[PDB]
Design a protein around this motif. Structure first.
Motif, short mmCIF file in Angstrom:
data_model
loop_
_atom_site.label_atom_id
_atom_site.label_comp_id
_atom_site.label_asym_id
_atom_site.label_seq_id
_atom_site.Cartn_x
_atom_site.Cartn_y
_atom_site.Cartn_z
N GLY A 1 7.15 27.75 17.50
CA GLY A 1 5.98 27.10 18.64
C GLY A 1 4.95 26.15 18.13
N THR A 2 5.22 25.28 17.35
CA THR A 2 4.17 24.52 16.55
C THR A 2 4.28 23.14 17.15
OG1 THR A 2 5.53 24.02 14.61
CG2 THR A 2 3.97 25.96 14.63
N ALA A 3 2.98 22.58 17.54
CA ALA A 3 2.79 21.00 17.83
C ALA A 3 2.25 20.13 16.73
CB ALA A 3 2.05 20.90 19.17
N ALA A 4 2.51 18.97 16.72
CA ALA A 4 1.76 18.28 15.91
C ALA A 4 1.15 16.75 16.45
CB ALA A 4 3.08 17.46 14.79
N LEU A 5 0.15 16.57 16.19
CA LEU A 5 -0.87 15.59 16.52
C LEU A 5 -1.43 14.76 15.16
CD1 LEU A 5 -4.05 16.56 16.62
CD2 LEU A 5 -3.13 17.89 18.48
N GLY A 6 -1.98 13.69 15.65
CA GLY A 6 -2.66 12.80 14.53
C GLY A 6 -3.15 11.70 15.07
N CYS A 7 -3.90 10.91 14.06
CA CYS A 7 -4.76 9.77 14.32
C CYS A 7 -4.33 8.71 13.42
CB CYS A 7 -6.15 9.97 14.02
SG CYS A 7 -6.96 10.91 15.38
N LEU A 8 -3.88 7.35 14.09
CA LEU A 8 -3.46 6.22 13.41
C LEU A 8 -4.59 5.21 13.02
CD1 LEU A 8 -1.46 4.19 12.03
CD2 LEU A 8 -0.76 3.65 14.45
N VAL A 9 -4.88 5.15 11.61
CA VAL A 9 -6.01 4.25 11.33
C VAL A 9 -5.28 3.30 10.83
CG1 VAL A 9 -8.16 4.19 9.87
CG2 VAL A 9 -7.20 6.51 10.60
N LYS A 10 -5.58 2.13 11.38
CA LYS A 10 -4.68 0.92 11.37
C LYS A 10 -5.71 -0.31 10.85
CE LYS A 10 -0.96 -1.89 13.02
NZ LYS A 10 -1.07 -2.89 12.33
N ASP A 11 -4.99 -1.34 10.05
CA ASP A 11 -5.75 -2.65 9.94
C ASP A 11 -7.26 -2.63 9.48
OD1 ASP A 11 -3.29 -3.45 11.12
OD2 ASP A 11 -4.23 -5.29 11.93
N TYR A 12 -7.33 -2.09 8.33
CA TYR A 12 -8.67 -1.88 7.86
C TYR A 12 -8.75 -2.52 6.26
CZ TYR A 12 -7.18 2.32 5.27
OH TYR A 12 -6.36 3.15 4.85
N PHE A 13 -9.70 -3.14 5.59
CA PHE A 13 -10.02 -3.45 4.51
C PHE A 13 -11.45 -3.58 4.06
CE2 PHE A 13 -10.72 -6.58 1.09
CZ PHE A 13 -9.54 -6.44 0.27
N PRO A 14 -11.97 -2.92 2.83
CA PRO A 14 -10.98 -2.50 1.74
C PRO A 14 -10.67 -0.97 1.77
CG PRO A 14 -13.21 -2.52 0.83
CD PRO A 14 -13.25 -3.25 2.27
N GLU A 15 -10.23 -0.34 0.91
CA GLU A 15 -10.05 1.19 0.57
C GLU A 15 -11.30 1.79 0.31
OE1 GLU A 15 -5.39 1.51 -0.43
OE2 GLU A 15 -6.78 3.07 0.41
N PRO A 16 -11.98 2.85 0.48
CA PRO A 16 -10.87 4.09 1.21
C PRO A 16 -11.54 4.23 2.62
CG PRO A 16 -12.28 5.23 -0.74
CD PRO A 16 -12.78 3.36 -0.62
N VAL A 17 -10.87 5.02 3.28
CA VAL A 17 -10.93 5.73 4.60
C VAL A 17 -11.14 7.34 4.43
CG1 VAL A 17 -10.64 3.81 6.07
CG2 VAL A 17 -8.97 5.61 5.49
N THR A 18 -12.05 8.03 4.93
CA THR A 18 -12.12 9.57 4.87
C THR A 18 -11.89 9.81 6.39
OG1 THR A 18 -14.29 9.68 5.18
CG2 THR A 18 -13.53 9.42 3.00
N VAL A 19 -10.86 10.81 6.61
CA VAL A 19 -10.68 11.38 7.99
C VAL A 19 -10.61 12.89 7.74
CG1 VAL A 19 -8.76 11.77 9.58
CG2 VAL A 19 -9.09 9.56 8.22
N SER A 20 -11.57 13.56 8.48
CA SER A 20 -11.65 15.03 8.92
C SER A 20 -11.20 15.14 10.48
CB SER A 20 -13.12 15.42 8.66
OG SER A 20 -13.96 14.82 9.41
N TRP A 21 -11.18 16.56 10.70
CA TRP A 21 -10.60 16.95 12.00
C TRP A 21 -11.65 18.12 12.35
CZ3 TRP A 21 -6.81 15.22 15.01
CH2 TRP A 21 -5.91 14.35 14.74
N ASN A 22 -12.26 17.75 13.58
CA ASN A 22 -13.32 18.86 14.27
C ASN A 22 -14.56 19.08 13.35
OD1 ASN A 22 -11.38 18.94 16.04
ND2 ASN A 22 -10.79 21.12 15.99
N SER A 23 -14.86 17.86 12.82
CA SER A 23 -16.11 17.76 11.93
C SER A 23 -15.99 18.70 10.57
CB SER A 23 -17.31 18.16 12.85
OG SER A 23 -17.51 17.48 13.75
N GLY A 24 -14.61 18.80 10.19
CA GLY A 24 -14.46 19.70 8.89
C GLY A 24 -14.15 20.95 9.22
N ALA A 25 -14.06 21.32 10.59
CA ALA A 25 -13.97 22.86 10.88
C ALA A 25 -12.12 23.09 10.82
CB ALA A 25 -14.46 23.15 12.21
N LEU A 26 -11.47 22.01 10.93
CA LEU A 26 -9.94 22.04 11.06
C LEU A 26 -9.45 21.37 9.80
CD1 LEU A 26 -7.23 22.79 12.33
CD2 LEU A 26 -7.41 20.82 13.75
N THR A 27 -9.00 22.40 8.66
CA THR A 27 -8.46 22.02 7.48
C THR A 27 -7.22 22.39 7.48
OG1 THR A 27 -9.69 23.78 6.39
CG2 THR A 27 -10.81 21.74 6.49
#
Ligand SMILES: *[C@@H]1O[C@H](CO)[C@@H](O[C@@H]2O[C@H](CO)[C@@H](O)[C@H](O)[C@H]2NC(C)=O)[C@H](O)[C@H]1NC(C)=O
Lengths: 49, 216, 216
Positions: C137-163
């Motif tokens: 019983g596990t569920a999956a969720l995410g965030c779609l980071v779309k249409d940016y230029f240039p690289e990079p982008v950094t993504v964290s979850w719950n301000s880094g508490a969720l890794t």
């Protein structure tokens, strides 16, 4: 011994001393069975200085 | 140009055991002086490529003695006496005889583990994205091994082509599995013209293809 | 120990010219023993050109003839490449591979640079649009980071508490010239109603800072 004599320059003939000065280099070729080797046994070396 | 090919395309390895990769040329690489001009290169993940073997048998200075190489005029082999965890990456064979010098397609090496099937998820586009006039459908394949998997998009049971992109994570240290996302991009108008969206996943750990779908 | 240090990363536009340097320290390098090898994104290594004692002059691949100039300066222990009339397909990481003592009619490349990323793109600096990938019983969720230029982008979850279980995929370059990625996490399905999940997206070139709450 296979001999070749190559002349590069005739510098001078001194009549008073009866001396001819020349610049040459001698081509000397011969066989030495003791220094015999095959390129295949030494990584393809065909010549050693 | 001389064409270089390698086999396998992926070699799952286990630290503490031997390994072997092979390369083949469509022309003989033997030189007139009697040595074969075939070099092997290792590109670790994130690092620059490193030379391992040059001229088909000679170990480069500073390379561990584990790596060895051999071959014939057209077929060559690179072997690892005892695989280490540091030996993971893409191995390239390169012919250095005839200009243009050509690299092979490359052989990927990774740590071996038990076959784990992907957990498949599908995500419909958010209302926020539809507000901007585009629609992205994301199919997720989570924590699977080996890397080889196939994802096919079906729209009302009609196979799609040329309108999806794929992105893979590197093998994580702990689980030793890969994760994959496939994103289907459609216009909002084209999005509204169909009802059922589905992604079909095939993987050797699955007894049969696994479908995840949603109805708008 | 010998080190090759290449010039910094370069942002270019089509039709322009880029010049990459490759400077050596800890060793002595000469007029020969220079080879340039590019790696396009998600592709294998490709030889571009080099200088060998046999030709006493640079030789290039047919793909780059007329556009590429390769030079090496013994006096200052550095080499350069200059690729002109840049195309979108010229986007790659460019490496210099060198040997202190050159092979007469081949190349090995014992010493490699760290590589320089050259991106040929007509796009402008632009921030991403962040969309949720909502959990179905596990569920999956995410965030779609779309249409940016240039690289990079950094993504964290719950301000880094969720890794744990977080997978941030490598960015994919779209035909529009803009990048897109997704960041996902698997969580217990029981925690969907009790626990908040927020992805923190940062794109420094645009100063985009988004905290998107993902919920069903
Ligand atoms: C290995 O493959 C290359 C590439 O196919 C061959 O080189 C080509 O040979 C054809 C002959 O029909 C020429 O028309 C091409 O111009 C050559 N170059 C390329 C890049 O195609 C090469 O001959 C093959 N070697 C052997 C011995 O099979």
């Amino acid at each position: 011994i296979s001999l070749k004599v190559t002349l590069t320059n005739l510098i001078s003939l001194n009549e008073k001393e009866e001396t001819l000065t020349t610049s040459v280099w001698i081509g000397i070729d011969w066989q030495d069975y003791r220094l015999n080797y095959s390129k295949d046994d030494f990584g393809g070396i065909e010549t050693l200085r | 140009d001389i064409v270089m090919t390698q086999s396998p395309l992926s070699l799952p390895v286990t630290p503490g055991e031997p390994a072997s990769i092979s390369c083949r040329s469509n022309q003989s690489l033997l030189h007139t002086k009697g040595y074969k001009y075939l070099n092997w290169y290792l590109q670790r993940p994130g690092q620059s490529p490193q030379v391992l073997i040059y001229f088909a048998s000679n170990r480069a200075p500073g390379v561990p003695d584990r790596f060895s190489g051999s071959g014939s005029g057209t077929d060559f082999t690179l072997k690892i006496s005892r695989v280490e965890a540091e030996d993971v990456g893409v191995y390239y064979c390169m012919q250095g005889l005839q200009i243009p010098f050509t690299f092979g397609p490359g052989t990927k090496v990774d740590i071996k583990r038990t076959v784990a099937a992907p957990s498949v998820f599908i995500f419909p586009p958010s209302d926020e994205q539809l507000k901007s006039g585009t629609a992205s459908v994301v199919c997720l394949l989570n924590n699977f091994y080996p890397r080889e998997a196939k994802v096919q998009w079906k729209v009302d049971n009609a196979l799609q082509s040329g309108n999806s992109q794929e992105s893979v994570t590197e093998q994580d240290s702990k689980d030793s599995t890969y994760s994959l996302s496939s994103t289907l991009t459609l216009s909002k108008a084209d999005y509204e013209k169909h009802k059922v969206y589905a992604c079909e996943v095939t993987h050797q750990g699955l007894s049969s293809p696994v479908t995840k779908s949603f109805n708008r | 120990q010998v080190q090759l240090v290449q010039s910094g990363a370069e942002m270019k536009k089509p039709g322009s010219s880029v010049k990459v340097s490759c400077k050596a320290s800890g060793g002595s390098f000469g007029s020969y023993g220079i080879d340039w090898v590019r790696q396009a994104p998600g592709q294998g290594l490709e030889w571009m050109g080099g200088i060998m004692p046999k030709f006493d002059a640079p030789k290039y691949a047919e793909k780059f003839q007329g556009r590429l100039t390769i030079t090496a300066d013994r006096a200052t222990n550095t080499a350069y490449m200059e690729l002109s009339s840049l195309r979108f397909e010229d986007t790659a990481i460019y490496y210099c591979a060198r040997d202190e003592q050159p092979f007469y009619d081949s190349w090995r490349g014992l010493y490699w640079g760290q590589g320089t990323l050259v991106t040929v793109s007509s796009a402008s600096t632009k921030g991403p649009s962040v969309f949720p990938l909502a959990p179905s019983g596990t569920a999956a969720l995410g965030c779609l980071v779309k249409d940016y230029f240039p690289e990079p982008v950094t993504v964290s979850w719950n301000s880094g508490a969720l890794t744990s279980g977080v997978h941030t995929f490598p960015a994919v370059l779209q035909s529009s010239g803009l990048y897109s990625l997704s960041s996902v996490v698997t969580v217990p399905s029981s925690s969907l109603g009790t626990q908040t999940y927020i992805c923190n997206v940062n794109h420094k070139p645009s100063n985009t800072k988004v905290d998107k709450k993902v919920e069903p």
